[PDB]
């Protein structure tokens, strides 16, 4: 059972795809982005408490989050909770090969963006070129990067520091292909200064990260293998442990599909409980569940996963949206469905889920 079930995104030609959502806390309300098929969209909705349901309003383009002569892609958003400010970090790629691609074909044009919100998301700044601060001189080294998608995260550390999932094909041969890895962008000053964190394990694309309970950052990606690949860090992201396979959380090979992770306080020793969404089919991208980890981030704590949605469902998105109606954590989550003919608004309660809980 679910509080909510709406189709926020919908196109038969799959214009929208790749949804990144995030909660707003003091306004108590969502934003919901995606790529349009290449521009950013957004639609702005408020948790009507009277009716416990999100109202959604009109879509509209996210104008600020381009470059001219780029597609803009992989949303990823965060609310920074010391100043109240909203950064929506995005990928920006040439529309056309470039000279400098027809000359040197996996030469790297990626840009890695930002523009930010001071007006809960209502306007945005300019956009801001991260490319060089972010990646420093190992961005020659590779073919291609990207961010998320969805949303990133902020710690709970002193400094309240920004941390930026993502990944990168790297160039190690000139004959083979690119593979890409994972890893992190970490900022402890808001976004003014960027450190490049440590790829994980080789062959692992989008991924998540989370915090948890000293405080380790937990990163889950997305491989080519039968099962998430998972690895945690003890300093904010910049080097992770050995990444492990998680098999209880299944990847349908060969191309594997984005999950989401966040993080909640538990219901109940340990601080946070994980809460993650990711199809459950063996091999297709169907049967959207949710799986919860009581003792994150350990591989075998993982539950058995519940059925969110049946069919067609693809790349997903999760926030926490503070206490639901029933009194149980409440969350929103936004995924790709129906052969990407849609991206769903899901809203529901922990105890909603996971009755057993309750
Ligand atoms: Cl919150
Ligand atoms: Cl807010």
Redesign the pocket.
Known sequence: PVLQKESVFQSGAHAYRIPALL?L?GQQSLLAFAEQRELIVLRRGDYDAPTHQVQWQAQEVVAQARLDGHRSMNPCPLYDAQTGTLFLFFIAIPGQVTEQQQLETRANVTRLCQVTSTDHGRTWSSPRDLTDAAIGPAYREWSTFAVGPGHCLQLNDRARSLVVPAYAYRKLHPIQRPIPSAFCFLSHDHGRTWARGHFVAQDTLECQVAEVEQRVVTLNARSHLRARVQAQSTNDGLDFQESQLVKKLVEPPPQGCQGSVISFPSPRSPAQWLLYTHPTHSWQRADLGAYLNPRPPAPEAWSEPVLLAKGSCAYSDLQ?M?TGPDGSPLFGCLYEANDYEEIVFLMFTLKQAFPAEY
Do not use: N
Request: no cysteine; net charge neutral; proline share 25%.
């Open positions: 909660y806390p926490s503070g």
